[PDB]
């Protein structure tokens, strides 16, 4: 689980529960389950907080990779209702945790920051400079190779 | 009232919000310089009367 | 295989090529980005995946020939532009 | 006589005990085409678009 | 390893002088000498270089005599003159590497473990620097291929110190372009960069042709570096990029238009002033 | 027209001579159905008129420009009609412009009845008749400016046309005539005006700036070229 919370890919709450609920809440004689996720009131509160952390990690992964994920797909991937997923995303955005623009009309959750023309042309210039440098380096290696295999 | 930036569309009903591009002060400076040069051309019109 | 210009990959095409369900392509592309094999971006509304690929690949003699003729086109374009600039700016060149 | 003596050299003994000799620098190509490489500017520098952010800032200022 | 080699101007004039003097009396291909310099964190800085007698036979390619005692005595003399310079490698004016360069590199390594071979061409080429620093690398090649001594490449650049810079400025004060981005020099530089890009692309295409025809081996490495280059292409004609670039071009053209208006107004004012001066002079004439 | 097409007017001519030639070429073009070129040339001629030196030339240029602009579908500026020197001269043209804008063909007929001989003596009667039979162009242009998806029946009602099919014919003729930029969708019979696009993100601003910068550089070159430097 600790590794799964550091890997940069979605973990589904349904699958995570199906895999770790027995081992994390109840435990066994060979699996001494702790009281962190117990059945007590604090146990349920911390279980809900763990679900919130899982959904936050999922949303972070989407914001890092996606650019425009429909509300339906975001809710499906976060294991939450459409309205609840929208509310969670709005709460995250208000706090400035992540950048998003919930277009409720078309169910669009566009993640990309607005591309000012200066930044776009700067990215193009950076790509061109990298291309030129790589071309020079490949020409140097090419001259080396021609030199060696006379 | 120049509060939160956006425009409504009653056709279907939404509150669109954008980032309000700054103004590009360069164009304001260019227009002011154009006015100044127009009045300088006017002054040269005042001159050149002496041939 | 993409022409390097239409780098956008439709979700249906990836589903057919990899024999993965419609919803599996999202996770597949996400894993590809995560491990470090592609440096693009993924879009769900249009169901098209932006592709910016950094991981290189081994080549074949036919692939090398294709790259060679494409670079020949590139160098001819560069030479044409250089000639145009030189001829148009002969007076200012010095 | 297309050169001039210097007050310093004059004070320390020029045209009195010591006399200067015109110093001519023998430079040749190959030795002048190799030295125009200290700052020769790579081809890339003549195709870099600067950066549009500070370019806009400079234009505005 | 060596991340970069800075060859100061004196090394170049010394290597041009050695090649000239050896060539003037007798004829010898290539010219071998020892390079002296100081080590920064990873940037070797070559400052001085002294000639070393070197006879070789091109036919055999394995016969070559380099003075050991002569090299050591020269290094001792230079240490007495300036001890901050330790041997860092060797240079040979031969435009291309040679089959016996590896043995000479090992001999140099005998005096300095991190030896850099700077090939200081004495033929003025308008496209590219006159130095190419090479190092010896022994690896297992990973990709199941026979390993050999070879010559790994290290980036080279020509710098200078205050004294060498002053000497260079005095020497090239009659053939030096004015410092400052005059439009003539900017347009000429852009043309030069286009020419350099064309030359590099032609070299890459020639190597690709050789690989396709089999005259040279398919590297399996660096080749995919060319593939990465071809992936990094800007991909112009995208609608968003086209709109942004048109916006930028118009934003620059408006400033150019304002500058043109200012220039026209200033020229018209100067013309008015000159005309009034001429008319006043004529009137005061009589 | 043949002479103007073949002969080339020197660029370094007097401003007054240029204005006279512009007026003549404007009349030639206007009589020849090149309305846009006539308007541009006559506006340039008015611009190049000798400040306040020739009243009659200004009067004639203004009258012909008013007629040509009315034909082209643009209602002329009222400042011309309000000017002190041109007021009485252009009063009949003011009435004509009123009639054209209001769209009252009867008002146009009574206007012609009173000052028809004056228009004739001014050498613009034929253009006035062309306006009498082209009045609908101004209404179509106003509809194009106002509406974006006007229904064919509604446009026919507004332009007091008899039937919608006549409205369709007139609208297509207008789309050629450079008066409108719409595209009729005959499937549902509504005139869909072209959607406006951000001109700045396009190339037209670059073209305008190029023309202006070329003019400025040419002016500077001409100014520095003479410089009238005296012989020492």
Curated annotation (Swiss-Prot), chain A:
Family to which this protein belongs: Belongs to the proteasome subunit p55 family.
Complexes and interactors: Component of the 19S proteasome regulatory particle complex. The 26S proteasome consists of a 20S core particle (CP) and two 19S regulatory subunits (RP). The regulatory particle is made of a lid composed of 9 subunits including PSMD12, a base containing 6 ATPases and few additional components. Interacts with ERCC6.
Residues represented out of the complete protein: 305 to 454 of 456
Gene this chain is encoded by: PSMD12
Function according to Swiss-Prot or TrEMBL: Component of the 26S proteasome, a multiprotein complex involved in the ATP-dependent degradation of ubiquitinated proteins. This complex plays a key role in the maintenance of protein homeostasis by removing misfolded or damaged proteins, which could impair cellular functions, and by removing proteins whose functions are no longer required. Therefore, the proteasome participates in numerous cellular processes, including cell cycle progression, apoptosis, or DNA damage repair.
Related illness: Stankiewicz-Isidor syndrome: A neurodevelopmental disorder characterized by delayed psychomotor development, intellectual disability, behavioral disorders, mild dysmorphism, ophthalmologic anomalies, feeding difficulties, deafness, and variable congenital malformations of the cardiac and/or urogenital systems.
Residue ranges annotated for the PCI domain, each copy included: 1-116
Highest taxon of source: Eukaryota
Spans traversing the lipid bilayer: none
Official protein name in the record: 26S proteasome non-ATPase regulatory subunit 12
Signal peptide: none
Residues where N6-acetyllysine is found: 64
From Swiss-Prot, chain B:
Induction data: By FOXO4; expression in embryonic stem cells (ESCs) is mediated by FOXO4.
Mod. after translation: Phosphorylated by AMPK.
Protein localization: Nucleus; Cytoplasm, Cytosol
Domain of life: Eukaryota
Tissue-wise expression: Highly expressed in embryonic stem cells (ESCs). Expression decreases as ESCs differentiate.
Function: Component of the 26S proteasome, a multiprotein complex involved in the ATP-dependent degradation of ubiquitinated proteins. This complex plays a key role in the maintenance of protein homeostasis by removing misfolded or damaged proteins, which could impair cellular functions, and by removing proteins whose functions are no longer required. Therefore, the proteasome participates in numerous cellular processes, including cell cycle progression, apoptosis, or DNA damage repair. In the complex, PSMD11 is required for proteasome assembly.
Family as reported in the entry's similarity comment: Belongs to the proteasome subunit S9 family.
Subunit structure: Component of the 19S proteasome regulatory particle complex. The 26S proteasome consists of a 20S core particle (CP) and two 19S regulatory subunits (RP). The regulatory particle is made of a lid composed of 9 subunits including PSMD11, a base containing 6 ATPases and few additional components.
Name of the molecule in the record: 26S proteasome non-ATPase regulatory subunit 11
Classification lineage: Eukaryota, Metazoa, Chordata, Craniata, Vertebrata
Residues of the full protein shown: 371 to 421 of 422
UniProtKB/Swiss-Prot annotation, chain C:
N6-acetyllysine sites (modified residues): 16
Stated family: Belongs to the proteasome subunit S11 family.
Subunit structure: Component of the 19S proteasome regulatory particle complex. The 26S proteasome consists of a 20S core particle (CP) and two 19S regulatory subunits (RP). The regulatory particle is made of a lid composed of 9 subunits including PSMD13, a base containing 6 ATPases and few additional components.
Functional note: Component of the 26S proteasome, a multiprotein complex involved in the ATP-dependent degradation of ubiquitinated proteins. This complex plays a key role in the maintenance of protein homeostasis by removing misfolded or damaged proteins, which could impair cellular functions, and by removing proteins whose functions are no longer required. Therefore, the proteasome participates in numerous cellular processes, including cell cycle progression, apoptosis, or DNA damage repair.
Protein name per UniProt: 26S proteasome non-ATPase regulatory subunit 13
Gene that this polypeptide is encoded by: PSMD13
Swiss-Prot record, chain F:
GO-annotated cellular components: cytosol; extracellular exosome; extracellular region; ficolin-1-rich granule lumen; membrane; nucleoplasm; nucleus; proteasome accessory complex
Key word Ubl conjugation present: yes
GO terms assigned for molecular function: enzyme regulator activity
Domain annotation PCI: ranges: 19-198
Highest taxon of the lineage: Eukaryota
GO biological process per UniProt: proteasome-mediated ubiquitin-dependent protein catabolic process; regulation of protein catabolic process; ubiquitin-dependent protein catabolic process
Family: Belongs to the proteasome subunit S3 family.
Protein's job: Component of the 26S proteasome, a multiprotein complex involved in the ATP-dependent degradation of ubiquitinated proteins. This complex plays a key role in the maintenance of protein homeostasis by removing misfolded or damaged proteins, which could impair cellular functions, and by removing proteins whose functions are no longer required. Therefore, the proteasome participates in numerous cellular processes, including cell cycle progression, apoptosis, or DNA damage repair.
Protein name (database record): 26S proteasome non-ATPase regulatory subunit 3
Species, as recorded: Homo sapiens (Human)
Gene name, Swiss-Prot/TrEMBL: PSMD3
Shown part of the complete sequence: 268 to 499 of 534
């Amino acid at each position: 689980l600790l590794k799964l919370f550091t890997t940069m890919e979605l973990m589904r709450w349904s699958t995570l529960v199906e895999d770790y609920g027995m081992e994390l809440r109840k435990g066994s004689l060979e699996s001494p389950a702790t009281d962190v996720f117990g059945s007590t009131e604090e146990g349920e509160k911390r279980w809900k907080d763990l679900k919130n952390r899982v959904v936050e990690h999922n949303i972070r992964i989407m914001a890092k990779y996606y650019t425009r994920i429909t509300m339906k797909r975001m809710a499906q991937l976060l294991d939450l209702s459409v309205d609840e997923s929208e509310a969670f995303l709005s709460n995250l955005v208000v706090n400035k945790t992540i950048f998003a623009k919930v277009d409720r009309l078309a169910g669009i959750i566009n993640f990309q920051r607005p591309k000012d023309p200066n930044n776009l042309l700067n990215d193009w210039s950076q790509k061109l400079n990298s291309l030129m440098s790589l071309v020079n380096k490949t020409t140097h290696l090419i001259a080396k190779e021609e030199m060696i295999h006379n | 009232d120049k509060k939160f930036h956006g425009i409504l569309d009653q056709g279907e009903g939404v509150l669109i919000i954008f980032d309000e591009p700054p103004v590009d002060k360069t164009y304001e400076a260019a227009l002011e310089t154009i006015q100044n040069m127009s009045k300088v051309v006017d002054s040269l019109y005042n001159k050149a009367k002496k041939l | 295989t993409r022409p390097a210009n239409h780098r956008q990959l439709t979700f249906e095409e990836i589903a057919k090529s990899a024999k993965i369900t419609v919803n599996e392509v999202e996770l597949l592309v996400m894993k590809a980005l995560s491990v470090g094999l592609v440096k693009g971006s993924i879009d769900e509304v249009d169901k098209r995946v932006h592709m910016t690929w950094v991981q290189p690949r081994v080549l074949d003699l036919q692939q090398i020939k294709g790259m060679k003729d494409r670079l020949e086109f590139w160098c001819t374009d560069v030479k044409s532009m250089e000639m145009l600039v030189e001829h148009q700016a002969h007076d200012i060149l010095t | 006589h297309l050169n001039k003596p210097s007050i310093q050299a004059l004070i320390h003994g020029l045209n009195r005990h010591y006399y200067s000799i015109t110093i001519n620098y023998r430079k040749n190509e190959l030795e002048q085409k190799m030295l125009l490489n200290l700052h020769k500017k790579s081809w890339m520098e003549g195709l870099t678009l600067q950066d549009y952010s500070e370019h806009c800032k400079h234009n505005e200022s | 390893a060596v991340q970069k080699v800075v060859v100061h101007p004196l090394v170049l004039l010394s290597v041009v002088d050695h090649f000239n003097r050896i060539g003037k009396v007798g004829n010898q291909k290539r010219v071998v000498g020892v390079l002296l310099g100081s080590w920064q964190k990873k940037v070797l800085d070559v400052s001085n270089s002294f000639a070393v007698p070197f006879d070789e036979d091109d036919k055999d390619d394995s016969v070559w005599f380099l003075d050991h005692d002569y090299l050591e005595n020269m290094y001792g003399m230079f240490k007495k003159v300036n001890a901050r310079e330790r041997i860092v490698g060797w240079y040979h004016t031969g435009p291309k590497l040679h089959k016996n360069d590896i043995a000479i590199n090992e001999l140099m390594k005998r005096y300095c473990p991190n030896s850099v071979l700077v090939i200081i061409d004495v033929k003025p080429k308008d496209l590219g620097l006159p130095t190419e620093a090479y190092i010896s690398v022994e690896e297992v090649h990973d990709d199941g291929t026979p390993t050999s001594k070879t010559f790994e490449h290290v980036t080279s650049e020509i710098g200078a110190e205050e004294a060498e810079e002053v000497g260079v400025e005095h020497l090239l004060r009659d053939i030096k372009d004015t410092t400052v981005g005059t439009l003539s020099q900017r347009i000429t530089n852009q043309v030069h960069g286009l020419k350099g890009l064309n030359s590099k692309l032609l070299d890459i295409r020639s190597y690709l042709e050789k690989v396709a025809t089999g005259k040279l081996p398919i590297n399996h490495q660096i080749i995919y570096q060319l593939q990465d280059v071809f992936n990094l292409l800007p991909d112009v004609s995208l609608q968003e990029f086209v709109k942004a670039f048109y916006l930028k071009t118009n934003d620059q053209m408006v400033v150019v238009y304002l500058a043109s208006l200012i220039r026209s107004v200033v020229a018209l004012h100067n013309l008015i002033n000159n005309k009034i001066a001429n008319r006043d002079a004529e009137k005061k004439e009589g | 027209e043949k002479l103007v097409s073949k002969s080339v007017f020197p660029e370094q001519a007097n401003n007054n001579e240029w204005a006279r030639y512009l007026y003549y070429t404007g009349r030639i073009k206007a009589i020849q159905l090149e309305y846009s070129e006539a308007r541009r040339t006559m506006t340039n001629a008015l611009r190049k008129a000798p400040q306040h030196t020739a009243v009659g030339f200004k009067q004639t240029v203004h009258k012909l420009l008013i007629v040509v602009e009315l034909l082209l579908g643009e209602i002329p500026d009222r400042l011309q009609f309000r000017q002190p020197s041109l007021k009485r001269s252009l009063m009949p043209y003011f009435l004509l412009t009123q009639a054209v804008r209001t769209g009252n063909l009867a008002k146009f007929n009574q206007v012609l009845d009173q000052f028809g001989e004056k228009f004739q003596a001014d050498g613009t009667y034929t253009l006035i008749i062309r306006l009498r039979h082209n009045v609908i162009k101004t209404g179509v242009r106003m509809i194009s400016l106002s509406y974006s998806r006007i229904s064919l029946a509604d446009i026919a009602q507004k332009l007091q046309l008899d039937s919608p099919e006549d409205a369709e014919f007139i609208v297509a003729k207008a789309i050629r005539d450079g008066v409108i930029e719409a595209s009729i969708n005959h499937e549902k019979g509504y005139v869909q005006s072209k959607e406006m696009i951000d001109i700045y993100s396009t190339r037209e601003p670059q073209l305008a700036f190029h023309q202006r910068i070329s003019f400025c550089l040419d002016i500077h070159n001409m100014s520095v070229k003479a410089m009238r430097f005296p012989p020492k």
